[PDB]
């Protein structure tokens with residue numbers, strides 16, 4: 249499920265004009281068009297941080313895992329963070345990160361890439377939460393729900409063995425406790441066989457993370473449409489302002505360099521309009537993902553087809569680029 | 577009863593203290609009025625714009641230039657005054673979607689926490705939900721979520737089963753706890769130790785398949801009533 | 805020589821969101837007061853004089869749960885709490 253969106257800032261003067269022309273004196277006759285768009289863009293830029301704070305910051309206490317990792321025969325080595333890595337991610341998280349090809353332009357570094365849209369006034373702001381911090385929020389959420397169950401989401405963290413925790417979770421769907429206490433090895437082997445198939449079904453088929461690629465590529469498409477509309481005329485003689493200024497006669501330029509200005513204002517308004525439209529979908533997806541975390545990870549839900557297909561027992565979230573992955 | 581009533585009264589009396597302080601508690605209701613005022617202020621502040629024409633006053637242009645040369649500046653002002661209003665209507669229809677998505681969530685929370693009790697965690701407040709009280713607010717609603725928060729936990733020794741006579745005993749609605757010497761049964765969310773009784777536990781299988789089974793005596797509530 | 809008219813500077817810092825000028829970076833960690841970007845937040849704290857400081861945001865409290873295979877935690881009391889929701 250997607251969670252966040254690429255925060256984009258737009259330099260209005262560098263997009264409409266070319267930062268080397270007397271166009272900036274003609275843009276002041278409109279006044280408040282370059283401020284409303286950047287205000288609406290700052291609203292999206294703080295909304296995509298609020299959407300991450302509403303999903304991943306559900307607990308205010310970072311829980312840790314014990315050094316001896318015995319949980320009644322269950323193996324969580326593929327979902328726990330690997331300490332022999334600089335990113336300190338899980339064995340599923342490093343495969344989820346390597347399958348989402350990001351194309352953002354938020355950096356400091358300087359044949360050119362697709363991030364040449366910075367030179368036209370279209371920059372990318374970095375998110376507030378680093379991916380290492382998201383991977384540690386994920387680690388705290390796993391260390392709470394493994395060593396405590398659902399007690400860390402309602403009050404203080406109460407310790408419980410994982411065999412008794414799953415025996416408690418069998419009672420939520422109508423199954424008695426004697427099924428696990430007579431068949432613990434079969435449940436442990438089925439869980440360790442179903443966990444290892446997740447990395448096999450994720451590294452294959454090449455289209456598992458389509459919902460994250462569909463929100464990564466759409467921002468780049470909306471940016472490349474905004475840049476490719478700059479090389480247009482809107483019914484004038486040329487697209488380069490430095491040719492119309494250095495060729496035509498001053499009082500007949502207030503129509504040919506008015507058509508380009510109105511066209512570039514309409515393109516910016518269109519870009520802000522479709523981004524404000526598609527941000528309500530990412531906000532709805534984040535409001536659904538936070539409810540899914542609270543009802544499947546922080547507790548046990550009895551809702552059908554809300555925490556997977558079947559009778560829900562527990563869930564495990566994994567950190568994803570611009571989203572989250574649930575292991576139901 | 578008196579402790580729960582005093583805790584509820586002390587938690588209700590702190591709501592008015594937490595609401596009258598910090599000066600920014602009702603931000604979600606102030607931001608809607610701030611946006612609806614900023615849009616209405618921007619719609620008037622763009623009437624003083626010329627959009628590349630001679631002047632922003634219409635009666636100057638209709639009494640200044642030619643009966644058919646003023647119709648290219650008036651048509652320039654009209655195609656910006658109909659664009660600002662279209663942008664205002666588009667942004668209002670965008671904000672109306674978020675307002676409707678918040679109102680549907682508010683109605684769902686009202687029906688699922690005020691009109692009843694919900695088992696959805698963190699939907700009717702943080703903790704085990706008990707009650708919820710609505711309050712009339714300007715352009716919104718305020719829910720006072722009464723929740724159950726456990727506190728003052730203690731450490732005990734647990735066991736999956738109790739072996740009395742070669743049979744495995746499992747708790748019906750409780751859990752086997754130990755205070756160091758004896759073994760008791762209590763509920764999961766509150767410490768209330770009771771004796772191991774055949775009415776509190778049920779029998780299923782032997783003591784050879786259950787891992788971690790311990791040895792204790794399961795008290796029969798019939799055998800003292802048979803010797804006497 | 806710049807479109808910006810003035811120029812200010814007290815202390816420079818290399819943040820991933822850009823060059824932060826006017827805040828001193830400390831090795832401590834607190835709650836995020838003013839978000840800057842990429843795990844860096846700014847606040848107004850004293851240390852006597854008051855100044856704008858830069859820091860990495862606090863993830864929360866660290867609490868290692870004493871988990872074992874033969875221990876349970878049962879609460880003995882409770883607390884009735886009322887939480888507002890606007």
Ligand SMILES: *[C@@H]1O[C@H](CO)[C@@H](O[C@@H]2O[C@H](CO)[C@@H](O)[C@H](O)[C@H]2NC(C)=O)[C@H](O)[C@H]1NC(C)=O
Pocket residue numbers: 317323324325326444
């Ligand atoms: C949990 O599962 C992982 C694999 O999913 C196990 O790691 C394997 O350990 C064997 C040792 O016999 C190695 O040969 C494999 O290469 C390991 N696999 C990977 C992917 O690293 C691990 O032993 C299991 N148990 C625990 C307690 O972690």
Ligand SMILES: *[C@@H]1O[C@H](CO)[C@@H](O[C@@H]2O[C@H](CO)[C@@H](O)[C@H](O)[C@H]2NC(C)=O)[C@H](O)[C@H]1NC(C)=O
Pocket residue numbers: 755756757758
């Ligand atoms: C564990 O609990 C049992 C019973 O709840 C305690 O046994 C009681 O101890 C007190 C004082 O030590 C005596 O006055 C009672 O007569 C005992 N009752 C029974 C039924 O034996 C026991 O002391 C507790 N142990 C610990 C370490 O707290």
Ligand SMILES: *[C@@H]1O[C@H](CO)[C@@H](O)[C@H](O)[C@H]1NC(C)=O
Pocket residue numbers: 356357
């Ligand atoms: C800034 O410049 C210095 C030297 O020019 C360089 O070493 C450093 O890597 C640059 N910063 C970034 C974030 O690349």
Ligand SMILES: *[C@@H]1O[C@H](CO)[C@@H](O)[C@H](O)[C@H]1NC(C)=O
Pocket residue numbers: 739789790791
């Ligand atoms: C419990 O008692 C049975 C029979 O007295 C014995 O076989 C078993 O080993 C005992 N278990 C433990 C843990 O002492």
Ligand SMILES: *[C@@H]1O[C@H](CO)[C@@H](O)[C@H](O)[C@H]1NC(C)=O
Pocket residue numbers: 316318871872873
């Ligand atoms: C139970 O836990 C102890 C310490 O926590 C450990 O030494 C022991 O090996 C565990 N039992 C099993 C069967 O692994």
